[PDB]
Design a protein around this ligand. Sequence first.
Ligand SMILES: *[C@@H]1O[C@H](CO)[C@@H](O)[C@H](O)[C@H]1NC(C)=O
Ligand SMILES: *[C@@H]1O[C@H](CO)[C@@H](O)[C@H](O)[C@H]1NC(C)=O
Length: 271
Amino acid sequence: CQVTNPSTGHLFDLSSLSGRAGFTAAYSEKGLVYMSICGENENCPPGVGACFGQTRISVGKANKRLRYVDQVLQLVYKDGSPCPSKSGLSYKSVISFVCRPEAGPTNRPMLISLDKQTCTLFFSWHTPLACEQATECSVRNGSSIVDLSPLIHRTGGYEAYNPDFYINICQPLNPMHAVPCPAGAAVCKVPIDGPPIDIGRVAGPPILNPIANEIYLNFESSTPCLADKHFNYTSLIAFHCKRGVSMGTPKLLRTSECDFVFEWETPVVCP
Ligand SMILES: *[C@@H]1O[C@H](CO)[C@@H](O)[C@H](O)[C@H]1NC(C)=O
Ligand SMILES: *[C@@H]1O[C@H](CO)[C@@H](O)[C@H](O)[C@H]1NC(C)=O
């Protein structure tokens, strides 16, 4: 139950979570999905690695094929009960292990979405077990050192105050009430009756420009742009010092075909 990052030669190990005893993911105040990570769950039919409901409805047969896909580790449990939507179909689960450097109170899988017509359940597990480098969230500005970490949203995300935009810095977006933003995404566009788009992932440490007196954070998505298939969707945050009784929320500046630029007026970049 382990996989490697083919780029930096970094081994990830999830066998820490393995076993028939397994874990639960909540779909209500008391209603749970039962799952194990590599190998079946004791609370399910044989083979079945994730199931739920009074009658153990299978949402995938267990496998240990743990895949690495863009700073997100992933299992796809396959072949559950039939589908009412598209006839010859089966319920399946996509378990997406997302990096959360912190301890974090939750530490369990969570149901982000169900693709009804293709019967896909999407779970996410925000875990330190899916991290490589630590949160690069600070930069040096002369004698001082500006920490943007106070702006890292730790339990959810930020708005953008009509296509919605949700954004988080230094870390992926956390799962949030009925907003199925893709797993791993730091910057997420949400259109109406189009699926949520990843328009940027954590790209590195905040970069400082001392002439224009601005701090930049850059974001790059894995998903290819619409107009040109050879560029990725991109994101930029311009940080501006602004004395205030509260830290600002990132307003959007302007957009091109593939690029997105955001300003953030926070009393956090102030000397
Ligand atoms: C960095 O420190 C200097 C001196 O205090 C200040 O003028 C500047 O606004 C600070 N931040 C940036 C973004 O350069
Ligand atoms: C765009 O994203 C893909 C997948 O993450 C990556 O392989 C590629 O290098 C990025 N940029 C380009 C050159 O399209």
